[PDB]
């Protein structure tokens, strides 16, 4: 999962929409596959068909969220000519939240996901710009 | 952190270097607070067993206070020793490495420049 994040962040922002979208979709699909694996492990399905349907549904939802977020953020960076700006990532996060609402087919969870994941994507953008460390190496 | 210090002479509560330090006074405020902790535990011991709290078993409350004072005195001795060791190691390492700890060129305020942000 380390090489997926580097290959997503190696592309300059607002430059290559297709490759950024593909990298975001791959990251989303990996996360959805992990979620589906734990789901079919702990909550066992009725049959093989129900389990593979749940796996496909979760993976497709997460991959669609990733693709929509990447495409929206890259397009907003292209249009505004502001590559280093967390507003583009906020727009992409709200687009991903609206996609999550569309997949689950309910408006309220979609709006809440728009707000919360737009804030989260903006925070990730600020951390990338300012060099915030989440798993900080021991120093003192 | 300090296991290299406490590695050549292991499992010692107070090494022989601790005796060069001033012992805590018996009127130490921390020691008095630990004695108050002992008194409070004695009162709780009276309370949970449905005894008169301030009257029953004065020997029990005295032993509570005495035990707390004893253990707290030795813990305070160890704490003071370990902070002394911390400072000693810090100063020895600062003195032994003068290249890494240069003297800061202090400047008066007539030479330094600070931006002014008006509040209006």
């Amino acid at each position: 999962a380390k090489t997926l994040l580097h290959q997503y962040w190696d592309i300059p922002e607002g430059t290559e929409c297709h490759r950024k979208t593909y990298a975001a979709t791959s990251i989303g699909g990996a996360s959805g596959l992990v979620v589906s694996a734990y789901s079919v492990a702990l909550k066992t399905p009725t049959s093989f068909l129900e389990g593979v349907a749940r796996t496909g549904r979760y993976t497709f939802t997460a991959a669609a969220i990733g693709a929509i977020f990447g495409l929206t953020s890259c397009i907003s960076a292209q249009v505004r000519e502001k590559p280093d700006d967390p507003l583009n990532y906020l727009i992409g996060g709200c687009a991903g939240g609206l996609t999550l609402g569309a997949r689950t087919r309910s408006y309220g969870i979609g709006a809440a996901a728009c707000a919360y994941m737009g804030l989260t994507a903006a925070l990730v953008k600020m951390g990338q710009l300012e060099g915030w460390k989440v798993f900080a190496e021991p120093k003192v | 952190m300090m296991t290299g210090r406490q590695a050549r002479a292991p499992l010692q509560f107070l090494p022989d270097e601790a005796r060069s330090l001033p012992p805590p006074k018996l009127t130490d405020p921390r020691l008095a607070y630990i004695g108050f902790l002992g008194y409070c535990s004695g009162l709780i011991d009276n309370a949970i067993r449905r005894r008169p709290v301030l009257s029953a078993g004065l020997h029990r409350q005295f032993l509570y206070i005495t035990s707390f004072v004893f253990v707290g005195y030795y813990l305070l001795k160890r704490q003071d020793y370990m902070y002394a060791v911390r400072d000693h190691d810090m100063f020895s390492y600062i003195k032994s490495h003068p290249e890494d700890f240069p003297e800061k060129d202090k400047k008066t305020y007539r030479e330094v420049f600070e931006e002014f942000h008006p509040v209006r």
Binding site: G127, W132, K133, V134, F135, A136, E137, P138, K139, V140 | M1, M2, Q6, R30, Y33, I34, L37, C40, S41, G42, I44, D45, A47, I48, R49, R50, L75, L76, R78, Q79, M82, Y83, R86
Partner: protein
């Protein structure tokens, strides 16, 4: 159970823990672990009901899997280093296997699934012995091998443990399951601060041991295992309601109680190493532990739930249980914050 056989078995448990603590050989660490587990199995099965045998079976399977993983890590380290001295490891695979073996033995998430069921199936005294004494040896082994521990793995285990423990304890009504999820969250905190300053880990371990011992001792003093039976305590002994109120407030880390000191010093240590997001996330997550603690205090001390008729028959008799060290750990778990600089004795 014979008193003498019980004495011998308890000293065998402490002997296994001592053998793990004092030895410089990996095989002796393994030997102490199996001695401790083999001796502690009959403490779980003191009552001989199907729930105790089920809990003992799950505990045995989990500890045996963790022990085999530990032996695998030791053998890999011997293969790649040719020695057995308990110190930093010479292989990342051996370090990963040993870290996950110690995580399985501690019951940290996602290996946490055995802790609440095992704690529920066994008596209160054996559950106290488990959740207090069984965690001294894996944390000592972790304290000995910190130069080889992967930072990402241990931090992931820590944050997962804290979140899963809080979310799990939100839903429980049995007291033993609440104590188990609380334990999971606290081990998350302890192994979170492990790689930066292990003295903070020792301080958090000591404070958690004292607070858990106080809460379990109050539970066996009142013979309560559910929320409602604990809520009946106001009509039997209100001093115990005051004690459980102050101890549960201190367990949530509310200042100026002694439970504030571990997370305060942990946040102090984590910000020195330029890690700011994780201590904020762990504090916000520990608010959930505070939530179900406060729910318990609402049901027990700050309201008067309806009682029954036979409480009068219980009024006419005094208690005779040996509430050993209960006032001492009640005082030491609430009014220890002014003695915070005492943590320098643990370095």
């Amino acid at each position: 159970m014979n008193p003498i056989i019980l004495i011998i078995i308890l000293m065998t448990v402490m002997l296994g823990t001592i053998i793990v603590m004092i030895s410089t050989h990996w095989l002796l660490i393994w030997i102490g672990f199996e001695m401790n587990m083999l001796a502690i199995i009959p403490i779980m099965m003191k009552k001989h009901n199907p729930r105790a045998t089920e809990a003992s079976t799950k505990y045995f399977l989990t500890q045996s899997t963790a022990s085999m993983l530990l032996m695998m890590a030791i053998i890999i380290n011997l293969m790649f280093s040719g020695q057995w001295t308990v110190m930093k490891l010479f292989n990342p695979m051996a370090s990963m296997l040993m870290t996950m073996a110690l995580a399985m033995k501690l019951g940290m998430a996602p290996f946490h699934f055995w802790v609440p069921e095992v704690t529920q199936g066994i008596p209160l005294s054996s559950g106290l012995i488990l959740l207090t004494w069984q965690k001294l040896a894996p944390m000592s082994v972790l304290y000995q091998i910190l130069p080889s521990i992967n930072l990402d793995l241990i931090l992931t285990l820590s944050i997962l443990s804290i979140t899963i423990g809080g979310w799990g304890g939100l839903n429980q009504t049995q007291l033993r399951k609440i104590m188990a999820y609380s334990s999971i969250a606290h081990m998350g905190w302890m192994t979170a601060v492990l790689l930066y300053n292990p003295t903070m880990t020792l301080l958090n371990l000591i404070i958690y041991i004292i607070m858990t011992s106080t809460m379990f001792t109050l539970f066996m003093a009142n013979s309560t295992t559910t929320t409602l039976s604990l809520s009946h305590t106001w009509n039997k002994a209100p001093i115990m309601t005051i004690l459980v109120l102050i101890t549960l407030l201190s367990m949530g880390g509310l200042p100026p109680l002694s439970g504030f000191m571990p997370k305060w010093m942990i946040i102090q240590e984590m910000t020195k190493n330029d890690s700011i997001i994780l201590p904020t996330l762990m504090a916000i997550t520990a608010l959930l532990n505070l939530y179900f603690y406060m729910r318990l205090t609402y049901s027990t001390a700050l309201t008067m739930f309806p009682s029954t008729n036979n409480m009068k028959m219980k009024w006419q008799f005094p208690t005779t249980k040996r509430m050993t060290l209960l006032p001492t750990m009640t005082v030491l778990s609430t009014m220890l914050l002014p003695l915070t600089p005492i943590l320098s004795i643990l370095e």
